[PDB]
Design a protein around this ligand. Sequence first.
Ligand SMILES: [Ca+2]
Length: 279
Amino acid sequence: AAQTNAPWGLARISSTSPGTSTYYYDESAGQGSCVYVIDTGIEASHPEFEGRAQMVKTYYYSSRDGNGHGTHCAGTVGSRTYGVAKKTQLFGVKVLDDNGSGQYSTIIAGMDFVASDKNNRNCPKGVVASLSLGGGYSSSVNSAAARLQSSGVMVAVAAGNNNADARNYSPASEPSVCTVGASDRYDRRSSFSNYGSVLDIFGPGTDILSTWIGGSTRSISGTSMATPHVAGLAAYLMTLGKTTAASACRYIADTANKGDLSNIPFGTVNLLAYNNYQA
Ligand SMILES: [Ca+2]
């Protein structure tokens, strides 16, 4: 399948070269997979989600996304227009308040929730969790991310936006999960993207168009935006039978575009997520 005039980031993950605007993908489009978006929530009523999104948990007085960030990330995973995996099921877990903040104990609770909750959902092709959040190093937070991964969920995490080594941020620094940096439409590392030997992969993170609250859309930047590209790609590949939750990060790195990025510090991988689709 081909979607013309796609957001640049969708075009980029289905291309060997920058500078094109068509997203090429298998029509299966992540059907039968599930993706948990652990964030500020999801505006499930947004037309772009077509009834495929729902809120399953909150730790606040409401499950509503009063911020926008979680809706945007969910949009990049699985919205009809802006998403990688256009037929995936999206589940929202609201660990961040409407200011975008959360205590680590809440975030930890949210990750352990997903490890259990996946047993209550129909996801025959596999389960992914997308975590577009972080903060300073915490062994407790890393341990929670490692447990979620161990439980059979592909965990994709944002590297952070400090232009620093991601080894000092959590859960970015947990080795067993898939830590995602950000690139721009000219194949440069995004200027804010963290880096380091703990990164596994880069995805599109600068000027990413997706869903927003109030039934709207907007373009924003961050490793928060790169992470859902990789989460959506994992869901897509698992539907196709190419990989599993345990192996998906490795498979994505093995099949990535290699050596195409600029401004990669020595010691950081030069790997850009790629869906390997040949129509
Ligand atoms: Ca890793």
